[PDB]
Design a protein around this motif. Structure first.
Motif, short mmCIF file in Angstrom:
data_model
loop_
_atom_site.label_atom_id
_atom_site.label_comp_id
_atom_site.label_asym_id
_atom_site.label_seq_id
_atom_site.Cartn_x
_atom_site.Cartn_y
_atom_site.Cartn_z
N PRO A 171 0.86 -1.21 0.00
CA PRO A 171 0.00 0.00 0.00
C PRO A 171 0.88 1.24 0.00
O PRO A 171 1.94 1.28 0.61
CB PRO A 171 -0.81 -0.15 1.29
N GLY A 172 0.48 2.28 -0.74
CA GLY A 172 1.30 3.47 -0.81
C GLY A 172 1.02 4.44 0.32
O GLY A 172 -0.13 4.85 0.52
N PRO A 173 2.01 4.80 1.13
CA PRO A 173 1.78 5.77 2.20
C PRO A 173 1.52 7.14 1.57
O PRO A 173 1.90 7.46 0.44
CB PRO A 173 3.09 5.77 2.98
N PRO A 174 0.86 7.98 2.37
CA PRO A 174 0.75 9.38 1.93
C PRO A 174 2.13 10.00 1.76
O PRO A 174 3.09 9.61 2.41
CB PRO A 174 0.01 10.04 3.11
N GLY A 175 2.19 10.98 0.86
CA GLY A 175 3.43 11.69 0.63
C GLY A 175 3.77 12.65 1.76
O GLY A 175 3.11 12.74 2.79
N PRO A 176 4.85 13.40 1.56
CA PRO A 176 5.30 14.37 2.54
C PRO A 176 4.34 15.56 2.64
O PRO A 176 3.57 15.84 1.74
CB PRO A 176 6.64 14.85 1.98
N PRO A 177 4.44 16.32 3.72
CA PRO A 177 3.66 17.56 3.84
C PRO A 177 3.91 18.50 2.68
O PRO A 177 5.00 18.62 2.11
CB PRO A 177 4.15 18.17 5.17
N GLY A 178 2.85 19.19 2.26
CA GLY A 178 2.88 20.14 1.17
C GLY A 178 3.67 21.41 1.51
O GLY A 178 4.16 21.64 2.60
N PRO A 179 3.79 22.24 0.49
CA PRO A 179 4.44 23.54 0.68
C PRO A 179 3.69 24.39 1.68
O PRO A 179 2.49 24.25 1.90
CB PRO A 179 4.36 24.19 -0.71
N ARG A 180 4.49 25.31 2.24
CA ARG A 180 3.94 26.34 3.13
C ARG A 180 2.91 27.16 2.37
O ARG A 180 3.07 27.46 1.18
CB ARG A 180 5.06 27.22 3.65
N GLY A 181 1.82 27.56 3.05
CA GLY A 181 0.80 28.39 2.48
C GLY A 181 1.26 29.82 2.21
O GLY A 181 2.34 30.26 2.58
N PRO A 182 0.35 30.53 1.52
CA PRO A 182 0.69 31.91 1.19
C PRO A 182 0.78 32.83 2.40
O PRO A 182 0.21 32.57 3.46
CB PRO A 182 -0.51 32.33 0.33
N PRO A 183 1.47 33.94 2.24
CA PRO A 183 1.46 34.96 3.29
C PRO A 183 0.05 35.46 3.52
O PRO A 183 -0.82 35.49 2.68
CB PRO A 183 2.37 36.05 2.71
N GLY B 110 1.12 6.22 -3.21
CA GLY B 110 0.20 6.65 -2.17
C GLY B 110 -0.53 7.94 -2.54
O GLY B 110 -0.28 8.51 -3.60
N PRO B 111 -1.42 8.33 -1.64
CA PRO B 111 -2.10 9.61 -1.87
C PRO B 111 -1.15 10.79 -1.67
O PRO B 111 -0.06 10.65 -1.12
CB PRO B 111 -3.23 9.63 -0.84
N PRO B 112 -1.62 11.97 -2.08
CA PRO B 112 -0.87 13.17 -1.73
C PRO B 112 -0.67 13.23 -0.21
O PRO B 112 -1.48 12.73 0.58
CB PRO B 112 -1.80 14.30 -2.21
N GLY B 113 0.40 13.88 0.21
CA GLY B 113 0.65 14.14 1.61
C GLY B 113 -0.31 15.16 2.23
O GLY B 113 -1.21 15.73 1.59
N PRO B 114 -0.09 15.38 3.52
CA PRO B 114 -0.92 16.35 4.24
C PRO B 114 -0.79 17.75 3.66
O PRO B 114 0.26 18.11 3.14
CB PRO B 114 -0.33 16.34 5.65
N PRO B 115 -1.83 18.54 3.80
CA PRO B 115 -1.67 19.98 3.55
C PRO B 115 -0.47 20.54 4.31
O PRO B 115 -0.18 20.14 5.46
CB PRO B 115 -2.99 20.52 4.11
N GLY B 116 0.28 21.45 3.72
CA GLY B 116 1.48 22.04 4.25
C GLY B 116 1.19 22.95 5.45
O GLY B 116 0.05 23.16 5.83
N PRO C 24 5.66 6.17 -1.48
CA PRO C 24 4.89 7.31 -0.96
C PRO C 24 4.34 8.17 -2.09
O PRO C 24 4.90 8.30 -3.17
CB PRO C 24 5.92 8.12 -0.17
N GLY C 25 3.18 8.78 -1.79
CA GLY C 25 2.57 9.71 -2.74
C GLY C 25 3.38 11.00 -2.86
O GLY C 25 4.42 11.20 -2.22
N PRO C 26 2.87 11.89 -3.70
CA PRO C 26 3.53 13.17 -3.89
C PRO C 26 3.32 14.10 -2.70
O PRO C 26 2.52 13.79 -1.81
CB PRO C 26 2.76 13.79 -5.07
N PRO C 27 4.01 15.22 -2.67
CA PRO C 27 3.79 16.18 -1.57
C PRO C 27 2.33 16.59 -1.57
O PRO C 27 1.68 16.57 -2.63
CB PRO C 27 4.68 17.35 -1.96
N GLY C 28 1.89 16.94 -0.37
CA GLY C 28 0.55 17.47 -0.18
C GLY C 28 0.35 18.82 -0.86
O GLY C 28 1.28 19.44 -1.40
N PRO C 29 -0.88 19.32 -0.77
CA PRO C 29 -1.16 20.66 -1.33
C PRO C 29 -0.63 21.74 -0.42
O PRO C 29 -0.27 21.51 0.74
CB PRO C 29 -2.68 20.67 -1.39
N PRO C 30 -0.57 22.95 -0.94
CA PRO C 30 -0.11 24.08 -0.09
C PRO C 30 -1.00 24.26 1.16
O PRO C 30 -2.20 24.03 1.09
CB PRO C 30 -0.23 25.28 -1.04
#
Lengths: 24, 24, 23
Positions: free
Chosen positions: A2-14, B3-9, C2-8
């Protein structure tokens, strides 16, 4: 496997500009 | 599988300071 | 794999209030 979720996404906008300052 | 996308950043930084207040 | 990075992430907080207006 099973594929784990990916890493945390980029930081949000200012955040938006702050409110206007107090009246002079 | 992939896997799915990661968590929101993380949250963005604070906005810039607001404008000067109303002229006195 | 693992999947891709999450959303912003969410929007930052509002900025600090501005300076007092000119006297």
């Amino acid at each position: 496997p099973p594929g784990p979720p990916g890493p945390p996404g980029p930081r949000g906008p200012p955040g938006p500009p702050g409110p206007p300052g107090p009246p002079g």
